[PDB]
């Protein structure tokens, strides 16, 4: 029971709840699954300026429950500190599914002549052009042309 401590309708107790989240979220994996609804309340609220972190622990708990397309939605909603991570489970499986959506999206939009596409959501392209520079400046261009395969 860590979400009933949120009747203070500012983000300034949502932040103490998140300071509880990033402390004991793996123990309280049972707890947030009911709190999916109020995490949605946090994402919908533009006045909640920590909505980046709302989508962060959203994709965390959906990575726990096995949601993956909504892990993609709130993975894009997570922000700029999303792609930059070097972690070996969470961030690389979800950017695996994300740039898998990028290549299947570029296939479907390569199957879609002259526009009318689904646009670039504002947190794609990050590790595309950032791990792409790892592949480039690691001086083997086979990934650098493998993306050119994958985008058509």
């Amino acid at each position: 029971g860590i979400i009933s401590l949120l009747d203070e309708d500012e983000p300034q107790l949502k932040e103490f709840a998140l300071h509880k989240l990033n402390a004991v979220v793996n123990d309280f994996w049972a707890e947030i699954s009911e709190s999916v609804d109020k995490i949605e309340v946090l994402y919908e609220d533009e006045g909640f300026r920590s909505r980046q972190f709302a989508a962060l622990v959203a994709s965390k708990v959906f990575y726990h429950l096995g949601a993956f397309e909504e892990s993609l939605n709130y993975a894009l909603g997570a922000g700029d500190l999303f792609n930059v991570n070097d972690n070996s489970e969470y961030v690389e499986t979800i950017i695996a599914k994300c740039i898998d959506h990028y290549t299947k999206q570029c296939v479907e939009n390569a199957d879609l002549p002259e526009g009318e596409k689904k646009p670039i959501d504002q947190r794609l392209e990050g590790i595309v052009n950032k791990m792409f520079q790892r592949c480039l400046d690691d001086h083997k261009y086979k990934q650098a042309i493998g993306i050119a395969l994958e985008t058509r």
């Binding site: 083997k140 086979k142 990934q143 042309i145 493998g146 395969l149």
Partner: protein, 55 residues
């Protein structure tokens, strides 16, 4: 060889996908022809039966 080591895998994969569909249908037709074989065992006789004895 990160350019075609992993992409030639689908090449000889599509084909046994199709044979994996295919041998099913060949089994679906050979039951028919098995029934035709079994019934065509019995078109010549066993109304007009003659009598010998085994030796």
């Amino acid at each position: 060889d990160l350019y075609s080591r992993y992409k030639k895998l689908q090449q000889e994969l599509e084909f046994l996908e199709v044979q994996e569909e295919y041998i099913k249908d060949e089994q679906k037709n050979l039951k028919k022809e098995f029934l035709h074989a079994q019934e065509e065992v019995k078109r010549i006789q066993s109304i007009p039966l003659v009598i010998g004895q085994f030796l």
